[PDB]
Amino acid sequence: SAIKPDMKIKLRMEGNVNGHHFVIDGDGTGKPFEGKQSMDLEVKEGGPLPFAFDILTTAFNRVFAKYPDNIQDYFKQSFPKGYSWERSLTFEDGGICNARNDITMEGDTFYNKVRFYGTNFPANGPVMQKKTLKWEPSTEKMYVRDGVLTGDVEMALLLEGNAHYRCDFRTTYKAKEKGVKLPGAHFVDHCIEILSHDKDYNKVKLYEHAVAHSGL
């Protein structure tokens, strides 16, 4: 009821990957109940980025996920006050990232304050050499670990040369308001796509479709 069927999205990301500093702005719309969102991104500082845009893209809100009536929707119940998440990304060649987002809502707009820090990417690796093509579609497993709603996902970045480059996501999610009830364990299928880009990925349009389910 706080959440409307059509919502706007405003975003700023600040960050640092292998010592390279950057600022990216986002402006988007989505449909919370249909699990669908898209966003226009614009690098404001630090471009052209010297690393694969793709590592960033899952950091640019689990409110945009279609929940059936039989799974508690922790994210939609967190509003208007909102919620935050923190995520670790562990890549198979030793690259590591920590991201966080603090999400708030004013009227019909979600505001997102995002931080992204990456380190230990090898200079000869697919991320620093810009050899990535896309994330494969994924299934996040949602469960409770020590009172905290936790999502794990085994992700795969398709590289040039038909190889995959693997990484493990762990995200913890916390409602701002005390006493929003935790859900039971469940799944969310995701698909994320770059729809269009310019030469150095200074402008990117992004799309995500997500659906919650009980595994059947």
Author numbering: 2 to 61, 65 to 220
Could you pull the original sentences from the published paper?
The mGeos series of rsFP’s display similar switching behavior to Dronpa. The series was developed from mEos2, with mutations that remove the undesirable irreversible green-to-red photo conversation, increase fluorescence brightness and provide high thermal stability of the off-state. Skylan-NS represents a further improvement, with reduced per cycle bleaching and higher photoswitching quantum yield in the on→off than Dronpa. We present high resolution room temperature SFX structures of Skylan-NS in both ‘on’ and meta-stable ‘off’ state collected using two different XFELs, the SPring-8 Angstrom Compact free electron Laser (SACLA), Japan and the Linear Coherent Light Source (LCLS), USA.
We collected datasets for the dark on-state using two different methods at the SACLA/EH4 station using the DAPHNIS chamber. For comparison, we obtained complementary data using the droplet-on-demand method for the dark on-state, using smaller crystals than those used for the grease method, which were delivered in the crystallization mother liquor. The hit-rate could be carefully controlled with the crystal density, and levels of 40% could be sustained with crystal densities of 4.8 × 107–9 × 107 crystal/mL. Table 1 shows the CC* and R-split values that reveal data from the droplet method was lower quality than that obtained from the grease injection method. The comparison between the two on-state structures collected with the grease injection and droplet methods under the same conditions (Black) showed the lowest R-factor over the intermediate resolution range up to ≈3 Å resolution. An increase of the R-factor for the increased resolution (<3 Å) is likely indicative of genuine structural differences between the grease and droplet methods, in agreement with the observed degradation of R-split and CC* when merging intensities together (Black). The R-factor for the on- and off-state experiments using the droplet methods (green) (but at different photon energy) is considerably higher than the two off-state measurements conducted at different facilities, including the lower resolution reflections. Following complete refinement of all four datasets, both on-state structures showed no statistically significant density in either the 2Fobs-Fcalc or the Fobs-Fcalc maps that could be assigned to a trans chromophore structure. The same was observed for chromophore omit maps, that also, at lower sigma levels, did not show such density. This is in agreement with the dark incubation and dark sample injection which corresponds to a 100% on-state concentration. Photoisomerisation is clearly seen in a comparison of the “on” and “off” refined structures where the dihedral angle of the chain connecting the phenol ring to the rest of the chromophore (N–C=C–C) changes from 1° (cis) → 171.1° (trans) in the on- vs the off-state and the pheonolic oxygen is displaced by 6.2 Å.
